[PDB]
RNA sequence: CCUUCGAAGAGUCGCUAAGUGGGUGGUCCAUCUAAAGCUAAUAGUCGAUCCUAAGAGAUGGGGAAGCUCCGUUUCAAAGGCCUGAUUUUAUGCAGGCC
C-alpha cells in the first residue's frame, strides 16, 4: 500500500514525572546542605 | 694470641615442677643434657522417559584408630526475582519481596 520504510523512536515513559522529581531532589539537597551548614556553627 | 661478653625446648619432668638445674648409675663419686629436626653404606499418538507414594539417602554437623556410622532441616552466610533519568563533594550500586 505504498508504504515508506524508517526507523522510529518510541516516547520514552514517564519523562515530565522523572523531570519534577528530579527537580524537587535537587530543591531538598540544596535546602538540607544549608540547614547542616548553618547548624555547624554550634559545635 | 690479647680483651669485653656469654641465651639453652612445661600439661613437660615427676595432681603437676627446677636452674651452680635436671636424668641415669656406683658402693660422696661417675656419666650425659630430655620435653625440636635431617641424614648414605521401523512409533510425535503403544510403554520407558515426567511426577510423587511407603521408604531409602547427600549436603550442614557430630562419633569412631579406621574400613565408616548417626542424623533429613538441624543455632548452615544453603537463592531467585523486581524497581531505578546513572548512584549530589561528581560516573567504585542503591532500595525492595519471598
Redesign the pocket.
Known sequence: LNSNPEILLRKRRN?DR??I??QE??KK?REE?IKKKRSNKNK
Request: glycine share 0%.
Open positions: 519523562a522523572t523531570r522529581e528530579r531532589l535537587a539537597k546542605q
